[PDB]
């Protein structure tokens, strides 16, 4: 009977985001906002498995534990194997109401208020636990309301919640040889409390922001 508790049912690590990015000597304006870094707003309604599992409840309250797995490889083979040089990566958690970096060398990377972790590729995956970041007592999986006070607000978007934004960059100044690095983010909710269970989703999802159904 312990396996079917809500905590065990929902507290499974899942690949919430996976996004590789090149870094080769990006002095020019090639691939703006993708030169040597990527950003990802921390939203749980990204993969359909986790969407359907979480949308079984109306209100949720949990702490998200994030583990980042990074791999480096190259297909150019312009020289010998020569191994892969050890790169240090910076992952900064930018909470809501704070400024997120727009470029790899932006001064926001050294804010001193946003929590940041520095880890190497050869090191084990970096782990951090994001606490319950909401002005309300629980996240709103479904929100029968409008965000803004004006009528142009979006339906279903709670201006509360909004856990934050996660940005990852390569700390090392661009080495002579470019490289492709892939960062995998795994989120595992912890200390989960759930309220008001709901019927399971039956139709395929149409969007990440709407409850629209096909049929």
């Amino acid at each position: 009977v312990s396996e079917t508790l809500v905590e065990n049912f929902l507290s499974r690590a899942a690949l919430v985001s996976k996004r590789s990015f090149e870094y080769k000597n990006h002095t020019s304006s090639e691939a703006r906002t993708d030169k040597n870094f990527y950003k990802w707003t921390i939203n749980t309604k990204s993969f359909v498995q986790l969407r359907r599992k979480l949308e079984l409840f109306t209100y949720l309250r949990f702490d998200a534990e994030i583990t980042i797995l990074t791999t480096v490889a190259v297909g150019s083979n312009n020289s010998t194997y020569m191994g892969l040089p050890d790169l240090t990566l910076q992952a900064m958690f930018v909470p809501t109401g704070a400024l997120t970096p727009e470029k790899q060398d932006s001064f926001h990377w050294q804010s001193g208020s946003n929590a940041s972790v520095f880890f190497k590729v050869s090191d084990p995956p970096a782990r951090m636990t994001i606490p319950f970041m909401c002005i309300n007592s629980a996240y709103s999986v479904f929100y029968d309301g409008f965000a803004g006070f004006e009528k142009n607000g979006l339906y279903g978007i709670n201006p509360a919640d909004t856990i934050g934004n996660l940005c990852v960059r390569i700390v090392n100044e661009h080495q002579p040889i470019g490289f492709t690095v892939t960062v995998r983010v795994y989120m595992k909710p912890k200390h989960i409390k759930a309220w008001a269970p709901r019927p399971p989703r039956t139709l395929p999802y149409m969007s990440i922001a709407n409850a629209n159904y096909k049929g």
Partner: protein, 190 residues
């Protein structure tokens, strides 16, 4: 008379009676978003647009007027945070088609609850059954139902009362009509 306390929680007496709706053999259902329904009527509406704040429960009474020769079943269900969805597009529902006021709206696809979920599993929500051969009334008591201790009545609908005919109304004549009366009594309205 045999009320249903939602989620086993028991949190004035005006009982704002909305205009009765006509239950036909081809009706799909009706829904009212509770804060929005009373936003434009009575001391509740006056206080709601006087203040920026609101906090209260609700009391729902649904009654049908039919004879012993009528048949049909209704599902009177109160859905918390019933975020609706569109049918064949990726754009979110608009303010006009979400906030229907005291008039309310009708279900386009009662089978999927206009949400993409299943009506068959909607019994998990606080609900009562109106089977015309056994009863004709249903009463539901609704708690606060909000994550925050405080709320804005003009932007967020905490409850959505839905009445869906699972078994269509029928009689000897091919055309049938049975009035349905909905009365909402907010309790400790702020």
């Amino acid at each position: 008379a045999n009320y249903c306390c939602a989620y086993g929680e028991w949190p004035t007496d005006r009982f704002y009676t909305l205009k009765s709706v006509k239950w036909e053999t081809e009706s799909t259902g009706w829904w009212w978003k509770l804060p929005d329904a009373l936003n434009n009527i009575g001391m509740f509406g006056q206080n709601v647009q006087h203040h920026y704040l609101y906090r209260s429960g609700f009391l729902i009474h649904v009654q049908c007027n039919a004879t012993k020769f009528h048949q049909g079943a209704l599902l009177v269900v109160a859905i918390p945070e019933h975020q609706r969805g569109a049918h064949n597009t990726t754009t979110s529902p608009g303010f006009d088609d979400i906030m229907k006021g005291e008039e309310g709206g009708t279900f386009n696809h009662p089978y999927v609850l206009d949400d993409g979920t299943s009506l068959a599993c909607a019994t998990i929500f606080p609900h009562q059954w109106i089977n015309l051969r056994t009863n004709n009334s249903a009463t539901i008591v609704l708690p606060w139902m909000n994550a925050a201790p405080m709320d804005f009545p003009l932007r967020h609908n905490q409850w959505t009362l839905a009445i869906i005919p699972v078994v269509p109304l029928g009689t000897r004549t091919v055309s049938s009509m049975v009035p349905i009366t909905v009365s909402i009594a907010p309790m400790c309205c702020e």
